[PDB]
Write an enzyme that holds these catalytic residues in place. Sequence first.
Site, PDB file in Angstrom:
ATOM      1  CG  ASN A  26      14.069 -14.558  -7.270  1.00  0.00           C
ATOM      2  OD1 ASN A  26      14.794 -14.099  -6.405  1.00  0.00           O
ATOM      3  ND2 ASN A  26      12.772 -14.663  -7.091  1.00  0.00           N
TER       4      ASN A  26
ATOM      5  CG  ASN B  90      12.091  -9.909  -6.619  1.00  0.00           C
ATOM      6  OD1 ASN B  90      11.585  -9.344  -7.568  1.00  0.00           O
ATOM      7  ND2 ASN B  90      13.096 -10.771  -6.746  1.00  0.00           N
TER       8      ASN B  90
ATOM      9  CG  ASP C 192      11.354 -25.059 -12.507  1.00  0.00           C
ATOM     10  OD1 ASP C 192      10.354 -25.043 -13.288  1.00  0.00           O
ATOM     11  OD2 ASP C 192      11.637 -24.142 -11.725  1.00  0.00           O
TER      12      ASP C 192
ATOM     13  CB  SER D 257      14.854 -12.519  -3.658  1.00  0.00           C
ATOM     14  OG  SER D 257      13.600 -12.301  -4.274  1.00  0.00           O
TER      15      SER D 257
ATOM     16  CG  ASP E  77      11.291 -12.211  -1.963  1.00  0.00           C
ATOM     17  OD1 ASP E  77      12.072 -11.401  -2.444  1.00  0.00           O
ATOM     18  OD2 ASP E  77      11.239 -13.377  -2.317  1.00  0.00           O
TER      19      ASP E  77
ATOM     20  CG  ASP F 178      14.044 -10.616 -10.282  1.00  0.00           C
ATOM     21  OD1 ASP F 178      14.121 -11.345  -9.265  1.00  0.00           O
ATOM     22  OD2 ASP F 178      13.044 -10.471 -10.928  1.00  0.00           O
TER      23      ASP F 178
ATOM     24  CD  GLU G  20      11.280 -11.145 -16.875  1.00  0.00           C
ATOM     25  OE1 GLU G  20      11.756 -10.558 -15.901  1.00  0.00           O
ATOM     26  OE2 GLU G  20      10.239 -11.826 -16.812  1.00  0.00           O
TER      27      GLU G  20
END
EC number: 3.2.1.17
Length: 129
Positions: free
Chosen positions: A59, A46, A101, A50, A48, A52, A35
């Site tokens: 995110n 990202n 989650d 967003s 979109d 990281d 990562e």
Amino acid sequence: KVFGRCELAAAMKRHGLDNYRGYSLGNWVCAAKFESNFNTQATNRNTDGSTDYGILQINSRWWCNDGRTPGSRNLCNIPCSALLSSDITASVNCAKKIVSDGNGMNAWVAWRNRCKGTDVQAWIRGCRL
Ligand SMILES: [Cl-]
Ligand code: NA
């Protein structure tokens, strides 16, 4: 801060990640490797819009507030910049919410693609823990 492999393993074990939700220490170190390259300051945008953040590339769409991801949640209730600290406490506590989650460590694409079903124990081999 750029962690050593064994240094990070030791930091993570102290913060309760060793076998957290059934994931051995090897899994967390393997994910941090692919990562962030163990760099707490790692950021990536990202498609979109967003971003990281940090050692586990958490995110801004779901997990932290960076004040530039419109219509995003802050489910760990922290500024994204807290995730870039040389203290991994905020990153570890937030990763505990994420892996709880329902999807486990599949939330981390690099884990799914590079760590899942490999010998992950190799990532802590030789470390004094
Ligand atoms: Cl799971
Ligand atoms: Na957010």
